[PDB]
């Protein structure tokens, strides 16, 4: 039984920086790609990025310059920072546990455990 | 250079100058001693995998016995001792045979001939592998037959060689001359 | 980079009908796709992975198939709770991409 | 003494003419003096033994193969290296901070020795970006990127070294694309070496020290010069 | 380590356990086969240049035959097989002889003795060079003479060894005892 | 059986007294039983053979000498290295951009291997400015400056390596200035190694793999340390 | 001929029964023909010889031990290295300016060769700060800091190399603190290697070339990788 | 690889194919010559320290004689020649014996057996050291005894080998057949 | 048959940059030292410099700071640049093919094929 | 640096006489000198190289000699077309030098 | 007989630099630690520092920042420089020869040959 | 860092009496201590080194003893010339420290 608990303020104004954290309780922290995904209103799922227990990361190109993902293996958490948020960054944000199998064909990958999701809106009000 | 490690004294009365593989050294764990004749070949051969393994196991035994062993390995010790124990070019020979599709020794399994009555054994030879399985016995039965012939011929020649270290050739010459003298003398009477 | 185009944009089907959803990759896949179901008010749920393997708690009516560039998700006899938005997702090394999604409604 | 030994070995010496002549002459001289599951050569049974290499664990590394993708070199009964052929990379940077690792001196020295031997045994390694590493906290993680004639490639040299190091059970993952001369090609994109704790992984091949010991002589034999004063 | 490469099966029925150098391996294009006796020395000697060259040529043949050859050389292959094929200290021995002004082997040319009737041959020995030219025969004729001597003695000794692997020593003892008994008995009658 | 073998070798074994005694006794016993271009040892002709090393071309490099100044190590039937002892330098800078060459990975890997073996075999090389190189476009051009006891000089070490690498043919260019111990001196100011295409250059000595094979064991045997962590 | 030879060893061959039978039968046949300070085996004296290794000085280094603290390796009749185990360090900086020493080329090439062989033979050396040097003016001064399981330490590796290099007379200074496996511990904080002039220092052990010759094969056998392209 | 250095021609007429250690080479400066029999073992043994030292001393002599010697040593020469002269794994064997507390050879002192009348000597063996002193003779007297045994047996066996290179086995067969024919014929008369 | 075609403006004002080029038609480009020589009025021959196919160069020390010689092996051409030309640089400029033999004594070197030559004058008019 | 002085500066010789020109090097030469002939209105022409070897198209009357520091060019019987200015030239590694020149005139 | 001859001005003003030199006459220069010690008025001995023939130095930490010790092996001398001297640096200054024995236990060290000493007073008068 | 404390600060003794001085180190010494005697108007004089060995010219009445942290200097029968200030001195690697000193007066 695995839970991912997400924390972080969702009420932001433009040009600020979104800080989200996800804490994992259940099973190992290594061997997984801890992943950030978002769904903007009226849009589909969008991969923000991922990080493993060695702090190696992968980012969506369209956000690379603004996105930073980090980990804390001491308390099994991982964090997302999005700098200079504009109205295009309003979305629901999910953390997820990803597993990749590349030892034999067919290789596969999936996100099997998801966090609840945090709504994030940026506005002037 | 060339391997130099000498095997420790045997743990078997049946093989005073041989070597015994103990219960732990073997998979189907029962003691197996090999005689001085087979073991002495390990002193001079350069392409017998079994002899290199004997030296490896004996070094392991002596290292544990005479050094303050610990769970933390001194990889330095084996790194410096390896070429005194084995011929890395024998490993290379088997590697080259493997990459060329020739049956090769992976050092796990060995066959030998055992005399059903006397109990004397030949020096174990590696059971070759190919395409992921051990060779069937019919594929190398010629080698086994050659080993049996060698066992017989070597036993006879060894009898001769020990006879020649005890009986001087001059004594044989004297016996021949005396017999010839007697045969010459008896002709005169008749 | 490999992108995923899903077919069709939306599906209108009755309960008990057979649902077939397609995902086409711009090139031969680095790894077999996986399929998620998403409803409003909750996180996406992993349905299928390796293009044909059911995840934990997924009813046997969910099946998958495909290879190369063509993959498909099948619901043999779709239940009323199977109406949601379905996504195909692919991962090449350190790059994860999602299909645009297919809406399955009554 | 020798008479009894000859009497025992009678069945194998009839065919010789000299022995028959000697026997006949001995019999004649004596008479005249009185007047005045696999059996070879009928007597040799074919027997076998298999060495338990595990007993060498305290003094030398032992390598074995679990399956196509997973292989191990164990050092003692507590630690070792897991070598995985895989399409899933775990390092996505171009660093290999060996000097900092040495300065910090937190790793297991035997494991660092084995890593050094492996890397120094690769022939013609000339693409430093193909090797990435992580040593923080004394761990050992090394990732060889095998992506791309196949003979003059990092993948081939790395795979030749891997084949020797995990000798026995390596072949099942290897030579899927049969190459020219001794060159090796596989479908895997990465070779990953990470430390691990001891466990009995040797499902496919028996543990053996042969590969490591053989590789010791290969060290530095085929390294390129990268500066004039080594 | 020590060389371990085993020579492939011979190309000549005249030498079942020997080795044949094909017309391509020789400067004058024609076949030359060597017997089991000369070739078996290569299995144990450490200072015979011709044996190292036989191993090199055999490895070249087997590599071409068993591997997918190409015009692009895999220098790695020979780089790792060399010490399984030859003794690099023999190259060193000849290098040291060269720098000291002693005649040395440059591995091109060899001489052997060939019986005019039986066709048995000695193991070829390197024809030494000094000051840019091959030694004149008269300068090493002593060596040649020694070889001829060996060719006789070994041959004779060979006959004994095979005889000692077929005729038990106990049988010879029994024959001697029977002859002695007959000689003792015939004395009483006279 | 053995009777005929004794019969053929009658001339040799006459001189022994024991054989004469045996022959005489056998004759007496039989009689009494009836009553009641270069030849050695007479039979050994001295014959010769010369090995065609060219047939090894597909699996190992072959070195040969054309004349005093020009020497070659050919790799296969397509490529090789020309080694020239010369007064005329072709590089007039102090660079040897080996790291850049490796990064670009355009050279012939076998040729780079041979260059590496040569340089690693030099004893006591300690003047990096004495070595200049050009590798642009995958070419191989290496230039050793031999200009200046002669034993502790770059010239001597380079020449010792050259003498071994092109063994059997090198001596004509060498030992002109006789030196102490095994040290070599020549009148040439430069040793140049450049890649070249295959041609039959072996006018002065036969092609031979011996020099290269011998040099393989010399690698790193006499290099100096240039930092504490190699 | 052989009759006299047999007559020589009569006391050693009587015990055999076959010899007694042969002698008795020969005597009977002859009669019937006439009718018509340490001593082994009583004959072998045990004798000794001791080699004068000093006569090798012109072609190979000779190591010897003066006392617990002072040991020497001599090159010829004029120069050598003094190796001292000591608590008194003479260098108090972290530099070892090897590249500058090479560029200046003032040191004795044989001595630098020995220093290189020693350092390259150390197993698992991974603390560059532990080694300090001074090469100004062509002198050779090398200081290894031995201060701190004893197996995975610089002190152990340095001491193993020292024990082999000064083999014979090393043991007196060594293994005071007994260690696991082959590991060495002493009470000395520094190993110092400085050039020196020739003198007969060999009070505790005879000069010998064995240690150095043995170490030649140890070079680079257990070095760590510090970079990917070496 | 394997050692290859051949010993130079002996300076002793008593041992034409042997080797003589001059007074310089020995601590008690005086000549000691060893015969061809003991010296020939150095050609093939891999674990005899005295043979490696013989090759070292011979190489020193030849290098001084044939090269332009000087006070400044050529480090490179011995560095490239050592493995053609000695087996570095023998040094390793003694090193491993030392660290394991086993008696070991430090290459200074050697013992051999000298025949009091004939002057025939065995191949010198290293006098082992342990705990800072040489072994007392009584601690390895068994070894000495074995050597004495070999000195006899080998000598006797040598007589046979030389005999088998001169007397054809066919001649012995003919002599046996003729003696048998005579013994058969003499029975008919009586 | 080898020609060395020569090109470049010969009319210059002081402090400009003389830029001459020489294209070789015939035989190989490697193994030669492509050379620039000049003859000032009422003066002997003066070696300006040389370059080979590896771009190694040699320059007259009295002109080193101001002289650059380059090659283009694509069209077998080599170029001379002289910066800050003064009245002392008025001369006839020749490109030539040099060959150096250093494989046996006596070593030798010569310039066997010469270009036509370019008159270069610098003045205020 | 090896420099060359030519001797003499000018010679006045009738056709059919013997012309001798000397070139002296400041030290022992690195390579044997070359000799060039040059007339106004054209490029210099290689006459002799290696101090004694005639170039292509050079008449046999042109000869050379010398070694060490002393070199000489000889015209046995000089034709009217041989009157020009003559240069010696030397090359050390990557450094070419010319003699100051000698003028032959009728 | 070993003598340590001291030289250097002893009259100083605050913020100046004290420069003392000591020349050794007798026995070798190597194998010793040439040492500077001082005694302030109404105070005990204080180790300033030491240097050997390899120019390796050791300094008192309370003076390290301002103290420099150097050697000249050509004339067997060693020198002390003390920068920015204040009234606390008025003292008698001694150079000495130190010898350390660390080859066997018990290790020992001593200063056996001492210079005469130089009085150094710093003030505004 | 190893520091030295001497005991006592001042000793008042008559000629012919036995003088005992102690030096205590804050930890086990790296090196056995040295003892110096110092009078006004001249340099200190080395008395004892290695905690028990007399220097040259030092009368036999000067003795020393000690180990670990405790060391002592002894004057069996003190002459009037022995009244001075006495210092113990220690050295660890490249660090020399002095004791604060003891005044031996009448
Ligand atoms: C040189 O070359 C030769 C020839 O190629 C090499 O020989 C191979 O050596 C390997 C390694 O030793 C051999 O593999 C072993 O096989 C046996 C036998 O397995 C068979 O019988 C079993 C019943 O006895 C049966 O279950 C097995 O079925 C399983 O495997 C097959 C495929 O083989 C599958 O199709 C099946 O579905 C099923 O999975 C099979 O028929 C095994 O005993 C052995 O595995 C045990 O031992 C290992 C070593 O300790 C452990 O790591 C394993 O986990 C396993 O241990 C036991 O596993 C049980 C199952 O879970 C578990 O219940 C139990 O508790 C556990 N422990 C114990 C103590 O029992 C191993 O796989 C292989 O057969 C040889 N190949 C050939 C062709 O002969 C040799 O290695 C080479 N040498 C070198 C140095 O390279």
Does residue H138 lie in a domain region?
no
Closest-CA residue of I relative to J57 is I112
d(CA D67, ligand 1 centre) in Å:
11
Q: Of E90, E87, B1, G221, which Cα lies nearest the Cα of H91?
A: B1
Distance from the Cα of residue K17 to its chain's centroid:
15
Instruction: Collect all residues of chain D within an 8 Å Cβ-Cβ radius of residue F138.
Output: none
Contact F36 H188 (CB under 8 A): yes
> Which residues fall within 8 angstroms of residue G56, CB to CB, at 6 or more apart?
G62, G209, H56, H57, H60
Left if phi > 0, otherwise alpha if psi is -120 to 50, otherwise beta: which for B120? beta
- Atom number, ligand 1, closest to the C-alpha of residue D168: 86
- Find out whether the beta carbon of D172 lies less than 6 Å from any atom of ligand 1: no
Domain coverage including residue I62: 3-122
Q: How far is the CA of D204 from the centre of ligand 1 (A)?
A: 6
Tell me how far apart the alpha carbons of residues D66 and D85 are, in angstroms, rounded to a whole number: 12
Cβ-Cβ contacts under 8 Å for K31 (sequence gap 6 or more): K53, K99
- With breaks defined as C to next N over 2.5 Å, after which residues does chain E break? none
Q: How many residues does chain A have?
A: 125
E174/D9 CB distance under 8 A: no
Stretch (H or E) spanning B51: helix B49-66
Tokens of F158: 């380079």
> Total domain count for chain I?
1
Which value, in Å, is the radius of gyration of the alpha carbons in chain I? 15
Helical H segments across D68-198, by residue range:
98-104, 109-121, 154-165
C-alpha A43/C-alpha E31 separation (Å) is: 82
Identify how the structure was determined.
Answer: cryo-EM
Task: Measure the CA–CA gap between B169 and G9, rounded to whole angstroms.
Answer: 11
Whether K contacts C, i.e. 3 or more CB pairs less than 8 A apart, is no
Q: Do residue H183 and residue D29 have CB atoms under 8 angstroms apart? A: yes
Cβ contacts of I51 on chain F, cutoff 8 Å: none
- Count other C-beta atoms under 10 Å from residue B190's C-beta: 12
Q: Is ligand 1 within 6 A of the CB of residue D168? A: yes
For ligand 1, is residue B134 a contact (CB within 6 Å)? yes
Smallest Cβ distance to B60: which of D47, D56, D109? D56
Measured between beta carbons, the chain F residues lying within 8 angstroms of I101 are 88
- Cα H146 to Cα B4, H112, H115, H153, J32: the distances in Å are 20, 12, 15, 11, 77
Q: Which two tokens stand for residue J102?
A: 């000698």
- Whether the CB-CB separation of J34 and J89 falls below 8 Å is answered with yes
Residues from chain B that touch H179, judged by Cβ atoms under 8 A, are 179, 183
Per the CB < 8 Å rule, is E71 touching F76? yes
Cβ proximity of C5 and C24 under 8 Å: yes
Quote the Cα angle for K85-K86-K92, to 5°.
75
Which candidate from C30, C31, C94 shows the least CB-CB separation from D92? C94
Nearest residue of J to residue F88, measured between CA atoms: J93
The CA D202 to ligand 1 mean position distance, Å, reads 8
Q: Chain G contacts of E180, Cβ < 8 Å?
A: 21, 25
β-strand F190-197 against F79-86: which pairing, if any?
A: antiparallel
Q: With contacts defined as CB-CB under 8 Å, which chain B residues touch E169?
A: 156, 159-160, 163
CB atoms within 10 A of CB A119: 12
Tell me the C-alpha distance between G86 and K104, whole Å.
Answer: 8
Q: Tokens at residue J46, please?
A: 């290689």
Sorted by sequence, the CB contacts under 8 Å of residue J18 that are 6+ apart come out as: J74, J75, J76, J77, J78
**Chains near L, with 3+ CB pairs < 8 A?**
G, K
Bridge partners (DSSP) listed for residue K110: K99
Residue among D69, D91, D187 minimizing CB distance to A56: D91
**Domain CATH for A60:** 2.60.40.10
- Nearest CA of chain E to the CA of G217: how many Å? 12
Tokens 């035997």 locate to D110
Contact K112 L46 (CB under 8 A): yes
Give residue D169 CA to ligand 1 midpoint distance, Å.
12
Residue-range definition of the domain harbouring residue E71: 1-105
Residues 6+ apart with CB under 8 A from I64: none
Burial F50-61, CB ≥16 within 10 A → b, else e: ebbbbbbbbbbb
Q: Do I108 and J50 touch (CB under 8 A)?
A: yes
Nearest CA in chain F to E163: F2
* Any atom of ligand 1 within 6 Å of the Cβ of D202: yes
- The span from the CA of E113 to the CA of E52, in Å, is 20
Contact I4, I77 (CB under 8 A): no
Q: What are E119's two structure tokens? A: 């066709």
Answer yes or no: do H4 and E90 touch at CB < 8 A: yes
F87–J30 C-beta distance less than 8 A: yes
| G and B touching (3 or more beta-carbon pairs closer than 8 Å) | yes
What's the rounded Cα separation, in Å, for the pair E76 and D181?
A: 10
Q: Please give the structure tokens belonging to residue D144.
A: 């060889």
Nearest alpha carbon, ligand 1 atom 28: D203
Residue K87's CB is within 10 A of a number of other CB atoms, namely 11
Number of domains within chain H: 1
Q: Which atom of ligand 1 is nearest to the CA of D64?
A: 86
Ligand 1: distance of its center to the CA of B108 in Å? 14
Any ligand 1 atom below 6 A from CB of D200: yes
Nearest-by-Cβ selection for F88 from I54, I58, I100:
I100
Task: Count Cα atoms within 13 angstroms, Cβ side, for C66.
Answer: 28
Q: Kindly state whether G9 is in contact with chain B, defined as any CB-CB distance less than 8 angstroms.
A: yes
Instruction: Name, in order, each residue with C-beta under 8 angstroms of D165's C-beta and a sequence gap of 6 or more.
Output: D63, D73, D83, D118, D121, D211, D212, D215
CA distance D122 to D184: 13
Say what the resolution is, in angstroms.
Answer: 1.9
**Residue of chain D nearest C91, judged by CA positions:** D88
What are F108's two structure tokens? Answer: 């012939």
How many CB pairs lie under 8 A apart between chains F and G? 57
Name beta bridge partners: K94.
K37
In chain D, what residues touch B95 (CB-CB under 8 Å)? 164, 167, 214
For the record, the structure tokens of L5 come out as 């404390």
For residue C52 the two structure tokens come to 């044909």
Q: Is residue B43 part of a domain?
A: no
CA–CA–CA angle K92, K98, K102 (5° rounding) = 145
CB contact under 8 A, E167 and D19: yes
Q: Which long-range contacts (CB under 8 A, 24 or more apart) does B154-161 make?
A: B154/B37, B154/E165, B155/B120, B155/D9, B156/D9, B156/E164, B156/E165, B156/E166, B156/E167, B156/E168, B156/E169, B157/E161, B157/E164, B157/E165, B158/B37, B159/D2, B159/D5, B159/E168, B159/E169, B159/E170, B160/E164, B160/E169, B161/H157
Give residues with Cβ within 8 angstroms of H183, minimum separation 6.
D29, D32, E179, E182
CA of D66 to the centre of ligand 1 (A): 10
The answer to whether the CB of B167 is under 6 A from ligand 1 is no
Closest residue in chain E to residue D33, using alpha carbons only: E182
**Residue of G90, G87, G194 whose CA lies nearest to K53:** G90
- Within a 10 A sphere around the Cβ of K108, how many other Cβ atoms? 21
Q: Tokens 């004063």 belong to which residue?
A: D229
SS3 C27: coil
Cα separation, B62 vs B39, whole angstroms = 18
Cα–Cα distance between D2 and B160 in angstroms, integer?
10
Report yes or no on H161 lying in a domain: no
Residue of chain E with shortest Cα separation from D34: E185
Neighbours of chain A (3+ CB pairs under 8 A): C, D
- For residue K43 the two structure tokens come to 């105070």
DSSP H4-64: -PPPPPPS-TTSTTSEEE-TTTBSS---EEE-HHHHHHTTT-SS-HHHHHHHHHHHHHHHH
The residue of chain G with its CA nearest to that of F225 is G116
Tell me the CB-side half-sphere exposure of residue H180, using CA atoms within 13 A: 20
CA distance K67 to K59: 7
B149 within domain boundaries: yes
Q: Please say whether the beta carbons of L51 and L32 come within 8 A.
A: yes
Nearest CA to ligand 1 atom 9: D205
Pick among E23, E59, E90, E91 to test the F interface (most F CBs inside 10 A): E91
Q: Provide φ and ψ at A36, rounded to 5°.
A: -115, 125
Give all chains having 3 or more CB-to-CB distances under 8 Å with chain J. F, I
**Domain covering J4-105, topology:** Immunoglobulin-like (2.60.40)
CA distance H121 to D64: 52
CA I62 to CA I39: how far, in whole Å? 15
Q: Which residues contact E65 (CB under 8 A, 6 or more apart)?
A: none
Is C96 in CB contact (< 8 Å) with chain D? no
| G199 touches G76 (CB < 8 A) | no
What DSSP string describes chain I?
--EEEEE---EE-TTSEEEEEEEEESS-STTSEEEEEEE-TTS--EEEEEE-TT--EEE-TTTGGGEEEEEETTTTEEEEEEES--GGG-EEEEEEEEEEE-SSSSPEEEEEEE---EEEEE---
- Rounded to an integer, what distance in angstroms lies between the CA atom of residue L103 and that of residue L106? 10
- d(CA A57, CA A64) in angstroms, rounded, equals 11
Residue B29 token pair: 């764990």
- Contact partners for chain H, using 3 or more CB pairs closer than 8 A, are B, D, E, F, G
Residues of chain A contacting D87 with CB distance shorter than 8 Å = 102-103, 107
User: Which ligand 1 atom is the nearest neighbour of the CA of D207?
Assistant: 85
| Backbone CA torsion sign across D175, D177, D183, D189 | negative
User: Any idea of the CA torsion for G20, G23, G24, G30, to the nearest 10 degrees?
Assistant: 180
Q: Is the CB of D67 under 6 A from ligand 1?
A: no
> Virtual CA dihedral for D96, D100, D102, D106, nearest 10 degrees?
-100
Domain chopping of chain C, boundaries: 4-105
Is beta strand A67-72 parallel, antiparallel or unpaired with respect to A77-83? antiparallel
């Amino acid at each position: 039984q695995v839970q991912l608990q997400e924390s972080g303020a969702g009420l932001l104004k433009p040009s600020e920086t979104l800080s989200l954290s996800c804490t994992v309780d259940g099973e190992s922290f290594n061997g997984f790609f801890w992943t950030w995904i978002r769904q903007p209103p009226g849009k589909g799922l969008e991969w923000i990025g991922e990080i493993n227990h060695l702090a190696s990361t992968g980012y969506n190109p369209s956000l690379k310059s603004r996105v930073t993902i980090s980990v804390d293996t001491s308390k099994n958490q991982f964090s997302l920072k999005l700098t200079s948020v504009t109205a295009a960054d309003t979305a629901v944000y999910y953390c997820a546990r990803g597993y990749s199998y590349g030892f034999a064909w067919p290789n596969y990958h999936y996100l099997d455990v998801w966090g609840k999701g945090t709504t994030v809106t940026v506005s002037s009000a | 250079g060339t391997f130099t490690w000498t095997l420790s004294d045997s743990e078997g009365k049946d093989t005073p100058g041989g070597y015994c593989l103990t219960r732990w050294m073997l998979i189907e764990a029962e003691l197996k001693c090999f005689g001085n004749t087979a073991v002495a070949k390990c002193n001079e051969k350069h392409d017998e995998e079994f002899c290199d393994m004997l030296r490896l196991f004996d070094f392991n035994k002596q290292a544990i016995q005479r050094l303050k062993a610990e769970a933390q390995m001194s990889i330095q010790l084996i790194n410096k001792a390896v070429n005194a124990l084995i011929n890395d070019q024998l490993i290379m020979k088997n590697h080259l045979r493997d990459i060329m599709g020739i049956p090769y020794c992976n050092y796990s399994k060995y066959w030998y001939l055992n005399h059903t009555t006397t109990g004397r054994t030949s020096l174990p030879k590696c059971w070759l592998v190919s395409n992921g399985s051990y060779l069937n016995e019919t594929h190398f039965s010629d080698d086994i037959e050659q080993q049996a012939d060698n066992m017989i011929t070597e036993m006879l020649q060894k009898e001769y060689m020990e006879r020649q270290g005890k009986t001087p050739l001059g004594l044989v010459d004297l016996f021949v001359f005396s017999t010839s003298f007697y045969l010459i003398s008896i002709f005169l009477h008749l | 980079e490999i992108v995923l185009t899903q077919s069709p944009a939306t599906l209108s089907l009755s309960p008990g009908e057979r649902a077939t959803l397609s995902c086409r990759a711009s090139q031969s896949v680095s790894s077999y796709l996986a399929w998620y179901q998403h409803k409003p008010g909750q996180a996406p749920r992993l349905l299928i992975y390796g293009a044909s393997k059911r995840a934990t708690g997924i009813p046997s009516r969910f099946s998958g198939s495909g290879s190369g560039t063509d993959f498909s998700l099948t619901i043999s006899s779709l239940e009323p709770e199977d109406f949601a938005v379905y996504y195909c997702q692919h991962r090449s090394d350190w790059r994860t991409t999602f299909g645009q999604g297919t809406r399955l409604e009554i | 003494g020798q008479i009894v030994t000859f009497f025992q070995e009678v069945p194998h010496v009839i065919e010789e003419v000299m022995n028959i002549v000697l026997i006949a002459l001995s019999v004649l001289a004596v008479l005249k003096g009185l007047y005045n599951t696999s059996l070879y050569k009928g007597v040799y049974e074919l027997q076998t033994l298999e060495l338990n290499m595990e007993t060498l664990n305290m003094t030398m590394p032992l390598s074995c193969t679990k399956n196509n993708s997973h292989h191990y070199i164990m050092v003692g009964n507590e630690t070792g290296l897991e070598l995985t052929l895989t399409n899933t990379s775990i390092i996505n940077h171009k660093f290999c901070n060996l000097s900092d690792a040495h300065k910090k001196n937190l790793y297991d020295h035997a494991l660092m020795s084995i890593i050094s031997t492996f890397h120094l045994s690769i022939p013609n390694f000339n693409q430093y970006e193909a090797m990435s590493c992580d040593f923080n906290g004394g761990k050992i993680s090394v990732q060889y990127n095998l992506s791309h004639n196949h003979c003059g490639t990092v993948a081939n040299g790395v795979l030749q070294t891997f084949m020797r190091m995990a000798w026995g059970g390596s072949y099942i993952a290897l030579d899927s694309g049969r190459g020219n001369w001794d060159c090796i090609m596989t479908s895997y994109q990465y070779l990953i070496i990470q430390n691990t704790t001891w466990e009995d992984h040797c499902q496919f091949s028996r543990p053996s020290p042969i590969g490591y010991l053989g590789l010791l002589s290969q060290r530095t034999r085929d390294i390129y010069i990268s500066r004039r004063l080594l």
